[PDB]
Design brief:
Three copies of one chain form a homotrimer.
Chain A: E1 9-25, H1 35-39, H2 44-50, H3 56-66, H4 69-176, E2 193-202, E3 205-221, E4 227-228, E5 234-237, E6 240-245, E7 248-253, E8 260-261, E9 267-270, E10 276-279, H5 295-299, H6 328-340
Antiparallel strand pairs in A: 1-3, 2-3, 4-5, 5-9, 6-7, 7-8
Amino acid sequence: QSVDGLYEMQIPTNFTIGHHEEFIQTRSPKVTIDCAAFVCGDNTACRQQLVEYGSFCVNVNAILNEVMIASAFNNALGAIQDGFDATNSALGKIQSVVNANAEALNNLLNQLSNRFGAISASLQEILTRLEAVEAKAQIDRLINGRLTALNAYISKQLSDSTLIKVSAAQAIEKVNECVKSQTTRINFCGNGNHILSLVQNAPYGLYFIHFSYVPISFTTANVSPGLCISGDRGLAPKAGYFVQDDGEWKFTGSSYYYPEPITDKNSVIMSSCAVNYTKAPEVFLNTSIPNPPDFKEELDKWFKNQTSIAPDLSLDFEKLNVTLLDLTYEMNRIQDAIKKLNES
Amino acid sequence: QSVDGLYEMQIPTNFTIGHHEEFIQTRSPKVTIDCAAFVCGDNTACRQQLVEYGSFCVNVNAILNEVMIASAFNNALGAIQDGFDATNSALGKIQSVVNANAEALNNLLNQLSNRFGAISASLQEILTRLEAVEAKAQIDRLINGRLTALNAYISKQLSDSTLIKVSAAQAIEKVNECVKSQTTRINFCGNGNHILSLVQNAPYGLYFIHFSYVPISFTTANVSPGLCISGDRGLAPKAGYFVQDDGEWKFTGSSYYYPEPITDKNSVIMSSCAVNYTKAPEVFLNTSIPNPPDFKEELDKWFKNQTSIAPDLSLDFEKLNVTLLDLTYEMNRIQDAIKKLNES
Amino acid sequence: QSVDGLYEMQIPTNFTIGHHEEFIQTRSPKVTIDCAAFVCGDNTACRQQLVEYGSFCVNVNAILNEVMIASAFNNALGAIQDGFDATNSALGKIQSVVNANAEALNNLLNQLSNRFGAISASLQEILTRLEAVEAKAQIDRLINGRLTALNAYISKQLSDSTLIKVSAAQAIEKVNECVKSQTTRINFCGNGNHILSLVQNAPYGLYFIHFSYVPISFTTANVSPGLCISGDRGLAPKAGYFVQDDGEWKFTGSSYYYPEPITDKNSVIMSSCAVNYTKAPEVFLNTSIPNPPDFKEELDKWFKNQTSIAPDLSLDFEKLNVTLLDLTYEMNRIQDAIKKLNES
């Protein structure tokens, strides 16, 4: 009684002697990243800022590398003289005040000239200082772009370094079980069935020569996983397979064969013809990167909506009313009086 | 004479035929990171800045994917006329100068209005330009936060990719020594003692069926690592263990057994009963991240403590003294003279 | 006829019993990075900005952890009085206008004082706001430097974690084939030829004791990879080597030996004396990091060469001409007339 089924395998029938040359890398080229070269190159402007960025490459490289009428007349003269004197005094007052105010206006013009000058100078300072900040901000964004790429490359470089550490470990076992000894493995240490091997060095690792023989010809047999007698005792093959041959059972060694009748030295007497099926759980590395919470909503938690406006720098003409003197009219009256006094 | 001690193992006594189903992932899902989606999402504001950040995703994805008275009278008229004429001339001068200065003040008011207007406009330009810079700086900090997280995820993604490369290599050996051949290994290629196996593909790797039998029942024996005769010749077991049985020594095969008397084909004649104890050094990956030099102390090396102040834009009233004309007093004297001349 | 050549190996002649103690790390210490501590330390200033940087450590730690004359006289008085009256009126007009303009100038001085005051205050606001931005920019550059180092350390930490996952897998096989069973491997499970082993736990992994015997003495033989009869039938050795002995051929087992004559049970009859030489391709991980496109050329694609200038805040003196009143000359004429009227 065949156990279960799922029979069939290719069984060696004849062999060929041959070689298999192989190389395993066991050590990596050493690296140094000259961060500035990676980030920007030789544009002085980026250099100027990178030097303020902190000692960045210390960590990058440490990680990667270590890895009656007369009286009236005289009376009038008195009044006339006093009249003219009062005028004389008034003209005196006018000259003084008007000239004083004229000077005050001239002093104002000079002070204003300087105040405006100073404002102009200040505004240029602000514009230069502010524009410089804005321009640098454009540069900083490009630099951070480049540095985050640098980190992507550090990670790739380290990952490959780890893969080498693993590979090198494999090389050590291949030395221990292929050159320092003769193992009993199939399709390892070269191919086929191992005989002998050589190990020589190569620039970054080990170069192996494996001597072995390989199945070169083989046949097909409906090899059974096992057999139960028609009754209740099970039989497993030992280092071979149960092979049905014209309906009967013989078995073959798994490395080369003769359909030998199954004897009691070619099988294991089983505790039961029952088949115990088991199944390992599957672990699948379906990694994905989550999309972080909305940018705006996060930013708003601390973002400052700070605004301001310029002062209302505007003069109010309502309280500033400057006018003219229409004296000519009165002057004309004076002139007329002068002419009348040319007639009396 | 038992050698050393540290005896005891579980030895197979009976067997069961069964299966072990197994899956090995050999290839990863392909990924692309659409950096913008990761960093911020669809907030136009972040998009606006990210496009200025440089061609960031080129490197991110390339890495992850590729992986007488009358005379006196007339005399007086002369003087009176000249007196009035001099007044007339003076009033002329006054009208002209005062009006001229009045115009100068009006021109000043108009020029000042424009100068202040221009200052106001400039201040608004600065405030807009400056506030815009400050607001963007708040955004840049959030973006860099998000990009540094992106790099943490690239590294995790690459690390898992490396782990798959290692796993895939394991799959290849499990194919070469379990399906393409029958190996002689224990608790490998499935479980127990390998007989046969099948390999079929699955979406991301290989799915194996392993046929084998397993110890299902076993016993306990105080198996010795070795034995020395009571004298000086040592004996090591071959593919089995020395088992003491009612005080004498038999040995058992390690895969199943009969307590067979130790014969000269069940042991190795040793060069000495001496025991050579050795010990590998321990390599323990207790990695830690150093805490970098103090932030302030580093920053200060280049930090610029640059300050400035606004110009002292203040008018000095000391040199600007504007006053009034108290002419009324003299006018009153004139008026009195006029009245006196109404009496003479 | 020797096949090919490349003969020679060291063949076991005598053995020693001994131990090999070994430890394999199978699990890592757990880590948490307190990002702020790494980035800057306890400088409040960096703390102040890092809290605005976003929830950075959420991702860092989630990844790492989860892992007739009288009439003339009266006539003249009329004219004189009218003359003085006209003067009186004119002085009235002068007092009013000059005083009015004097007030307008004083109001201007007060409004200007306030306008300049406001400008000064505004300029201080801009300078503070602007300087604060410039200072923070210096800090942001240092922080990004430090964060990009943090990412270099995350990648190293993850890489080591992967290496442990690989190591742990090795430990499991070393348990399955060294302690739970007796394998047939050489220089594995300890050293030499495995007999027995023990496994005990240790703080981060497994501690093994392996019992085995090792070749302690061995000889040299010019072992051939194979032999062809002088005719056309090839012979490969089985689990041993063909050894030429005084010109004839014997073979030895590969684990210990007697130069046994080659019998028909010590070799494989080959299909051909031909030697099949093969060679695996070499895969060498010579990874390098490309130098990105020129910084300037990339930046210029979006860089804004935006400039501006301060308004030409300058008063034009050409239209502002302020002058003085030379009235004294006429006054002198008036004074002379007064004296003449003291004589008539």
